[PDB]
Amino acid sequence: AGATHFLTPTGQASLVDDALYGWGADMLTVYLRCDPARLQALLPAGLKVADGLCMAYVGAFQSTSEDQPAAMLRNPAGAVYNEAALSIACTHGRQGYFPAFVWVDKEWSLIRGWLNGYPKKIGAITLARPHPYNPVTGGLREGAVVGGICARHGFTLFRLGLTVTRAGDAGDLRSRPATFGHRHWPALHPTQTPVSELVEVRSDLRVGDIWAGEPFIELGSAPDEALECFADHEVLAGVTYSYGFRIGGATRLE
């Protein structure tokens, strides 16, 4: 069921399948508030910024195609990726997030993302959590620390951290049901066929192993990024957790 480059009759060499995928992930998330007017400039036409709430995350993801549920056995690097993002709370009519800036370390997740309107670049991303068998720290508990960082082209993009203060629950995260995407494929020559459309993307959502705590975030700057759009912020809360979901193709809105 491979649907992209490299196209061959077998489909073995395609980056992404036309198939349902499943994800499990561990996440470090920091909620922020920026000037809503600055964030609106980053939103595609038809989405309205909320009160400036933003989420920064660094996560470690494990995805599986329903078309090849055992692919991890022979191709482990095709089954895991890391990702960092700065996402903006917004509305279409319906509450959601628009993930304006996303960096991932596997291009199959980049392209799958782009096809469903997720703006992604390639970066280097690390999520560090205390391993539960680590005898010096144990795992997640009060006093545990979690860290994340992402970088691209030699530039630090942002750093995130959490000092865990207590076990948490769904109250400690700002869930908004929709994820809005901008499926965009521009023309570099006037004869090329462009695509530009708003889409909405997840079923079977489970969230758990939630810990809340004292967050920190430090934004970097790069000549080919626009990180300053998130610079003048209020840091609201931090949480770390695990989550699983299924996604298909994102549905065209307009």
Next chain:
Amino acid sequence: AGATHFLTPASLVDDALYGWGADMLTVYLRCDPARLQALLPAGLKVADGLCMAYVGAFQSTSEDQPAAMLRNPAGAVYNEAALSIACTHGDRQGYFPAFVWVDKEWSLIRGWLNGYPKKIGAITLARPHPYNPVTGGLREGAVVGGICARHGFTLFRLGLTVTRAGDAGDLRSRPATFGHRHWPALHPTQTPVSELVEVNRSDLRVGDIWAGEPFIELGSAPDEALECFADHEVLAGVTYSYGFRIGGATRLESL
């Protein structure tokens, strides 16, 4: 004038003319034309099975930011390996670069936008540095090497033992580069794109050409189709430098 994500008033790619300079290691091969045809998009017809494998070190610059290299050096260089198929569109002769791996996603996306099928890999081109006092630079007896890998799998290895200075007779030049600009729908409501394009590069210059004894060794990966190039005859090897300018690829027809 960034034209892609991230769109802000941070784009990977500019709507602008780009220039490249590059050093290249190239091995020409012949495979079964019938196997290669299966890799060609509709409307391109395989030639006699001629294929080219290359590993190159590229330096690209946008005319919109000709000095970007000063502040963003990693945005100005990339490495790339490819397996390309000699083919025709009508009577016009070209190459279709069926499998390409590059190590910078701005080159991946620029490639995809102009119909180059690219993945991200790790690619190294090693050529003798002219100031190296043990070897000197390129000359008779010099060796050149290239390798590319993805997901931990070796994709292919290339090499050359230089035998003599060369000239354009040693490059199997075909004027067109044909692409498949492809953007599929993952939901039936999404708008797909599938169109054949032709890249014309202006200002092409080739030089510092050396010919020699080639070698190639194909790997295998569960998410690649390297076997399509496996049963081959190794024809020739060359290393050289080349520069050109490219704009967008012109649309030829829908698929």
Next chain:
Amino acid sequence: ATHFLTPTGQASLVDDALYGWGADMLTVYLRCDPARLQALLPAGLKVADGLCMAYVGAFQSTSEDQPAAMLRNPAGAVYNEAALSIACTHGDRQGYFPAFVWVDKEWSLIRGWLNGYPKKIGAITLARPHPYNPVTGGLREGAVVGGICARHGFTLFRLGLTVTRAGDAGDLRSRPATFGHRHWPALHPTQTPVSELVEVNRSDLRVGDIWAGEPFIELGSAPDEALECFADHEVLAGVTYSYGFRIGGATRLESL
């Protein structure tokens, strides 16, 4: 304790502090020709019956001295590692000699070398099913686990497991000692070399969440490696598990 040496000590790759590790592991046990493996052992170690261990792991290390360093330096707190290790003995004492090891963080490379663990830098991935993944679930009967490592563009080896059952410490082949060859050669005759056999024992050890299954291994080859030393093997067993440990400096046994 190492470069870069400064008055603060903040730029040292490796320090004297005690560390703890947690890890998830994929391990395949093998049997090779004992005579071939003996050629890889430093003087004073005797091969066992040819038993070997291949592993791929995702590791997380923390200093007792800086237990919260992970908050500001996450990439300094995690690494992946792959190894081919040889079961052997020093006298009647049973251990492993980890002949070939590849890691993706040089602070782990250097700590290894200082204790006689031979390490190179490679690219290493361990993939296990995430428990929240709704397509697969986590570790269970029928789950698959994969690992791969590569260097210089060459696949070094691939490992995998199809889980068949829950497991126990019985499915691991414990030999307490890790023998090392602490080696620092002279590149000029006036330089001071080091060559000595050392022994590490874990001062804290935990294994759990053990799953056994059907293994596979596929060795590659590279011009600057000696993977063929492990090539003609019998595949014995496979296991995936979680692991925790504490290690200090390795005690010198004898000069070489």
Next chain:
Amino acid sequence: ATHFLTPTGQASLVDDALYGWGADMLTVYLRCDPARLQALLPAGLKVADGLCMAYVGAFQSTSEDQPAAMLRNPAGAVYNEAALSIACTHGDRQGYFPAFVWVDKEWSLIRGWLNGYPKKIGAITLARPHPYNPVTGGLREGAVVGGICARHGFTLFRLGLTVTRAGDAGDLRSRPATFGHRHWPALHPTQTPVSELVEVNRSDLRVGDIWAGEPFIELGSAPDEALECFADHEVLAGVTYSYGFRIGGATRLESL
């Protein structure tokens, strides 16, 4: 030769053969407070007037007795490197001590350490205009050159040059010696440590294709680095050039 030690020796990271290098270099000269730089120097080296050099380079090395290794192992034949080095003296002998070095191939890290060059692994890019690029041309008046290095996600430093004129050896601040601290500490009191000052001299040296221009440097910061030691500087000059050299092992001068 080093790990991995095998009878063949095909798996050693480093051999004691003579090597030759060719390289393209971006260099910025600086002056810092000599008192801060002295704190980074090992005992027996005296800081000069505070002159430091920052460089980013693309290197290509070849073993004199494996001169064709690049054909089959290209990644073993090239590396990138960034450094901050301190002008100093040993007696009245003038040299550089390369206090902080980041390289992207561990065989270059280890060869460095053996010869007393303190090296870590980083990601390093040197970008120079390719002569065949029709938008820019190559090196000329008005050309721009850039270099950057990073580790653990932290930018370490950035360098750049806007070329103003062709240059010559007058534009280099050549000091014949490179002084090293060959250091191999003990992690257990029974282990044999090494700590000695060494001197490397080039037995073949070439510099050419020199261009001078307007430099820039921007130091970063990291929790596991000490880049602030170079922070309060005066930017003196910038140059890009090509370089070739042969080096063997560094000679031991004295213990530390």
